[PDB]
Design an enzyme around this catalytic site. Structure first.
Site, PDB file in Angstrom:
ATOM      1  N   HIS A  61      29.922   1.957   2.807  1.00 41.15           N
ATOM      2  CA  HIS A  61      29.265   0.760   2.304  1.00 41.15           C
ATOM      3  C   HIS A  61      28.346   0.139   3.341  1.00 41.15           C
ATOM      4  O   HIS A  61      27.365  -0.498   2.973  1.00 41.15           O
ATOM      5  CB  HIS A  61      30.292  -0.305   1.873  1.00 41.15           C
ATOM      6  CG  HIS A  61      31.363   0.221   0.974  1.00 41.15           C
ATOM      7  ND1 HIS A  61      31.116   0.608  -0.327  1.00 41.15           N
ATOM      8  CD2 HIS A  61      32.689   0.405   1.179  1.00 41.15           C
ATOM      9  CE1 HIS A  61      32.243   1.029  -0.878  1.00 41.15           C
ATOM     10  NE2 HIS A  61      33.211   0.918   0.013  1.00 41.15           N
ATOM     11  N   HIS A  91      28.835  -5.922  11.153  1.00 42.20           N
ATOM     12  CA  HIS A  91      28.109  -4.975  10.322  1.00 42.20           C
ATOM     13  C   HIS A  91      26.876  -5.674   9.795  1.00 42.20           C
ATOM     14  O   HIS A  91      26.693  -6.873   9.995  1.00 42.20           O
ATOM     15  CB  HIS A  91      29.001  -4.489   9.179  1.00 42.20           C
ATOM     16  CG  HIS A  91      29.406  -5.595   8.266  1.00 42.20           C
ATOM     17  ND1 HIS A  91      30.525  -6.363   8.498  1.00 42.20           N
ATOM     18  CD2 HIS A  91      28.800  -6.125   7.177  1.00 42.20           C
ATOM     19  CE1 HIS A  91      30.598  -7.310   7.577  1.00 42.20           C
ATOM     20  NE2 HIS A  91      29.580  -7.167   6.743  1.00 42.20           N
ATOM     21  N   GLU A 103      21.889 -11.059   2.156  1.00 45.83           N
ATOM     22  CA  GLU A 103      22.839 -11.541   1.156  1.00 45.83           C
ATOM     23  C   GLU A 103      22.615 -13.024   0.900  1.00 45.83           C
ATOM     24  O   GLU A 103      22.265 -13.431  -0.207  1.00 45.83           O
ATOM     25  CB  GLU A 103      24.267 -11.255   1.619  1.00 45.83           C
ATOM     26  CG  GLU A 103      24.501  -9.759   1.766  1.00 45.83           C
ATOM     27  CD  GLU A 103      25.910  -9.362   1.535  1.00 45.83           C
ATOM     28  OE1 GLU A 103      26.784  -9.868   2.263  1.00 45.83           O
ATOM     29  OE2 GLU A 103      26.143  -8.501   0.655  1.00 45.83           O
ATOM     30  N   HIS A 116      26.552  -9.658   9.985  1.00 51.33           N
ATOM     31  CA  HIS A 116      27.794 -10.394   9.812  1.00 51.33           C
ATOM     32  C   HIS A 116      28.718 -10.082  10.974  1.00 51.33           C
ATOM     33  O   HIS A 116      29.193  -8.954  11.111  1.00 51.33           O
ATOM     34  CB  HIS A 116      28.468 -10.016   8.499  1.00 51.33           C
ATOM     35  CG  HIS A 116      27.734 -10.523   7.323  1.00 51.33           C
ATOM     36  ND1 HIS A 116      27.919 -10.039   6.043  1.00 51.33           N
ATOM     37  CD2 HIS A 116      26.807 -11.500   7.243  1.00 51.33           C
ATOM     38  CE1 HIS A 116      27.151 -10.724   5.221  1.00 51.33           C
ATOM     39  NE2 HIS A 116      26.440 -11.597   5.925  1.00 51.33           N
ATOM     40  N   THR A 195      31.869 -10.838   0.836  1.00 51.35           N
ATOM     41  CA  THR A 195      30.787 -10.472  -0.068  1.00 51.35           C
ATOM     42  C   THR A 195      30.922  -9.067  -0.617  1.00 51.35           C
ATOM     43  O   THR A 195      30.050  -8.629  -1.359  1.00 51.35           O
ATOM     44  CB  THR A 195      29.421 -10.605   0.612  1.00 51.35           C
ATOM     45  OG1 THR A 195      29.349  -9.573   1.592  1.00 51.35           O
ATOM     46  CG2 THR A 195      29.206 -11.984   1.225  1.00 51.35           C
ATOM     47  N   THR A 196      31.997  -8.358  -0.305  1.00 53.27           N
ATOM     48  CA  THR A 196      32.336  -7.088  -0.926  1.00 53.27           C
ATOM     49  C   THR A 196      33.749  -7.202  -1.465  1.00 53.27           C
ATOM     50  O   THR A 196      34.545  -8.026  -0.985  1.00 53.27           O
ATOM     51  CB  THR A 196      32.278  -5.871  -0.007  1.00 53.27           C
ATOM     52  OG1 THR A 196      33.307  -5.990   0.985  1.00 53.27           O
ATOM     53  CG2 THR A 196      30.948  -5.760   0.669  1.00 53.27           C
TER      54      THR A 196
HETATM   55  N1  LIG Z   1      30.424  -8.867   4.138  1.00 51.77           N
HETATM   56  S1  LIG Z   1      31.644  -9.811   4.707  1.00 51.77           S
HETATM   57  O1  LIG Z   1      31.906 -10.920   3.827  1.00 51.77           O
HETATM   58  O2  LIG Z   1      31.403 -10.171   6.092  1.00 51.77           O
HETATM   59  C1  LIG Z   1      33.134  -8.797   4.717  1.00 51.77           C
HETATM   60  C2  LIG Z   1      33.527  -8.087   3.600  1.00 51.77           C
HETATM   61  C3  LIG Z   1      34.690  -7.295   3.656  1.00 51.77           C
HETATM   62  C4  LIG Z   1      35.434  -7.254   4.826  1.00 51.77           C
HETATM   63  C5  LIG Z   1      36.673  -6.394   5.064  1.00 51.77           C
HETATM   64  C6  LIG Z   1      37.766  -6.438   4.049  1.00 51.77           C
HETATM   65  N2  LIG Z   1      38.527  -5.193   4.200  1.00 51.77           N
HETATM   66  C7  LIG Z   1      38.829  -4.467   2.970  1.00 51.77           C
HETATM   67  C8  LIG Z   1      40.093  -5.112   2.398  1.00 51.77           C
HETATM   68  C9  LIG Z   1      40.707  -6.163   3.077  1.00 51.77           C
HETATM   69  C10 LIG Z   1      41.859  -6.744   2.558  1.00 51.77           C
HETATM   70  C11 LIG Z   1      42.394  -6.257   1.358  1.00 51.77           C
HETATM   71  C12 LIG Z   1      43.563  -6.840   0.832  1.00 51.77           C
HETATM   72  C13 LIG Z   1      44.091  -6.359  -0.355  1.00 51.77           C
HETATM   73  C14 LIG Z   1      43.469  -5.303  -1.027  1.00 51.77           C
HETATM   74  C15 LIG Z   1      42.318  -4.728  -0.508  1.00 51.77           C
HETATM   75  C16 LIG Z   1      41.784  -5.216   0.699  1.00 51.77           C
HETATM   76  C17 LIG Z   1      40.621  -4.627   1.215  1.00 51.77           C
HETATM   77  C18 LIG Z   1      39.039  -4.664   5.482  1.00 51.77           C
HETATM   78  O3  LIG Z   1      38.846  -5.197   6.525  1.00 51.77           O
HETATM   79  C19 LIG Z   1      39.860  -3.359   5.475  1.00 51.77           C
HETATM   80  N3  LIG Z   1      40.522  -3.199   6.774  1.00 51.77           N
HETATM   81  C20 LIG Z   1      40.917  -1.801   6.904  1.00 51.77           C
HETATM   82  C21 LIG Z   1      39.703  -0.906   7.138  1.00 51.77           C
HETATM   83  C22 LIG Z   1      39.427  -0.679   8.623  1.00 51.77           C
HETATM   84  O4  LIG Z   1      40.285  -0.993   9.492  1.00 51.77           O
HETATM   85  O5  LIG Z   1      38.332  -0.167   8.967  1.00 51.77           O
HETATM   86  C23 LIG Z   1      41.722  -4.039   6.788  1.00 51.77           C
HETATM   87  C24 LIG Z   1      42.167  -4.417   8.205  1.00 51.77           C
HETATM   88  C25 LIG Z   1      43.581  -5.012   8.296  1.00 51.77           C
HETATM   89  C26 LIG Z   1      43.986  -5.614   9.477  1.00 51.77           C
HETATM   90  C27 LIG Z   1      45.257  -6.156   9.588  1.00 51.77           C
HETATM   91  C28 LIG Z   1      46.135  -6.101   8.520  1.00 51.77           C
HETATM   92  C29 LIG Z   1      45.739  -5.497   7.335  1.00 51.77           C
HETATM   93  C30 LIG Z   1      44.462  -4.963   7.226  1.00 51.77           C
HETATM   94  C31 LIG Z   1      35.035  -7.961   5.932  1.00 51.77           C
HETATM   95  C32 LIG Z   1      33.898  -8.743   5.891  1.00 51.77           C
HETATM   96 ZN   LIG Z   2      28.956  -8.458   5.308  1.00 54.46          ZN
END
Ligand SMILES: NS(=O)(=O)c1ccc(CCN(Cc2ccc3ccccc3c2)C(=O)CN(CCC(=O)O)CCc2ccccc2)cc1
Ligand SMILES: [Zn+2]
Length: 257
Positions: A61, A91, A103, A116, A195-196
Site C-alpha cells: 500500500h 510513510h 490526503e 505521515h 486513513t487506511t
Molecule cells: N495513513 S495513517 O493514518 O498515517 C496510518 C494508517 C495505518 C497505520 C497502521 C495500522 N496497521 C494495520 C492494523 C493496525 C491495527 C489493527 C487492529 C485490528 C485489526 C487490524 C489492524 C490493522 C499496523 O500498524 C499493522 N502493524 C503490523 C504491520 C507491521 O508491523 O509492519 C501493527 C503493529 C502492532 C504493534 C503492536 C501491537 C500490535 C500491532 C498507520 C498509520
Molecule cells: Zn498515511
C-alpha cells in the site's frame, strides 16, 4: 482485499470497515479561513535527535521506514498533545501526477504527496493498544510539492529499487528524519482516524502548514514502486491516497495567526 483500485478502493472500504462512515474520519479538507487560531496550543516539540531507523518495507500500500520504538528515542510532544508519543514509522501517499497525491487538502488544493510520521502514546504501552484509544496516536503530516530536491529524502529514494514489490524489505539504519521537516512547525490540528483500513478513530492529526519541496525525479521514483508482489503483473504504486472525508462535528485549530 482493500486497496486503491476501481473495485477495492476508498469507496468500497465501508463494506469491510463500517467505521469508514464514522464521525471522525480522515483525511479532511483544511479550510484555512474557518480554522481558528487557538492561543492555548503549545509549540510542537519534535525530538528526533536519537531516532534509530531500522528497515524499509513495501507493504503493498506504501513503503514504511520503521524505527526502534522499544524506548523513548524519537518522540513527539507538546502542541495539542498530552504526554509522550513515540515514532514508530513514516510513510507517504502520492499521486500518478503532480496535481494529486495528498490526503489532506488545503482550501481544496491537493499536493503531490503527503508524509505521515506516525507516533503512539506511550501511556498505552504498545501500538496495538494505542490504536484502540481516542488519543492513542499522533500523526505528523507534511505536504510535498514538486520543485527543488529535498536532500534529506534522497537516501529513501535510492533504496526504493531494492523494495520494488509487495513484501520486500531492506536494511535502513542511520536515517535521520529531521531531514524531512520544513523550516516552520506551524500547524493545524483536529481529531481523526487512520486513513487506511482499519480506519480506527485514534489519531490526533497535526498537519504542518509549510510544505517541503521535492524534485520531479524524486517523486518519479516513488511512482516506480509496485503494489503487486514479485512475479505478478506490474501495477504501479500510484494514487495510494484516500480523499477528504466529511468534517462532521469537528473544529480544525491553527497554532498560528
Ligand atoms: N495513513 S495513517 O493514518 O498515517 C496510518 C494508517 C495505518 C497505520 C497502521 C495500522 N496497521 C494495520 C492494523 C493496525 C491495527 C489493527 C487492529 C485490528 C485489526 C487490524 C489492524 C490493522 C499496523 O500498524 C499493522 N502493524 C503490523 C504491520 C507491521 O508491523 O509492519 C501493527 C503493529 C502492532 C504493534 C503492536 C501491537 C500490535 C500491532 C498507520 C498509520
Ligand atoms: Zn498515511
Amino acid at each position: 482485499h482493500w486497496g486503491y483500485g476501481k473495485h477495492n478502493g476508498p469507496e468500497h472500504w465501508h463494506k469491510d470497515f463500517p467505521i469508514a462512515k464514522g464521525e471522525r474520519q480522515s483525511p479532511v479538507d483544511i479550510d484555512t479561513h474557518t480554522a481558528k487560531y487557538d492561543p492555548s496550543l503549545k509549540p510542537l516539540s519534535v525530538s528526533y535527535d536519537q531516532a534509530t531507523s531500522l528497515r524499509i518495507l513495501n507493504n503493498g500500500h506504501a513503503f514504511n521506514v520503521e524505527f526502534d520504538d522499544s524506548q523513548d528515542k524519537a518522540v513527539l510532544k507538546g502542541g495539542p498533545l498530552d504526554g509522550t508519543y513515540r515514532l514508530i514509522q513514516f510513510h507517504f501517499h502520492w499521486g500518478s501526477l503532480d496535481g494529486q497525491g495528498s490526503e489532506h487538502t488545503v482550501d481544496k488544493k491537493k499536493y503531490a504527496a503527503e508524509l505521515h510520521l506516525v507516533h503512539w502514546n506511550t501511556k498505552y504501552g504498545d501500538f496495538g493498544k494505542a490504536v484502540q484509544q481516542p488519543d492513542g496516536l499522533a500523526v505528523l503530516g507534511i505536504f510535498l510539492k514538486v520543485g527543488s530536491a529535498k536532500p534529506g529524502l534522497q537516501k529513501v529514494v535510492d533504496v526504493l529499487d531494492s523494495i520494488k514489490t509487495k513484501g520486500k524489505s531492506a536494511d535502513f539504519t542511520n536515517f535521520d528524519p529531521r531531514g524531512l521537516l520544513p523550516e516552520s512547525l506551524d500547524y493545524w490540528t483536529y481529531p481523526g482516524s487512520l486513513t487506511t483500513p482499519p480506519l480506527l478513530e485514534c489519531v490526533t492529526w497535526i498537519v504542518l502548514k509549510e510544505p517541503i519541496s521535492v524534485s520531479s525525479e524524486q517523486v518519479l521514483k516513488f511512482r516506480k514502486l509496485n503494489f503487486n508482489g514479485e512475479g505478478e503483473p506490474e501495477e504501479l504504486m500510484v494514487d495510494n491516497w484516500r480523499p477528504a472525508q466529511p468534517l462532521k462535528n469537528r473544529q480544525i485549530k491553527a497554532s498560528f495567526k
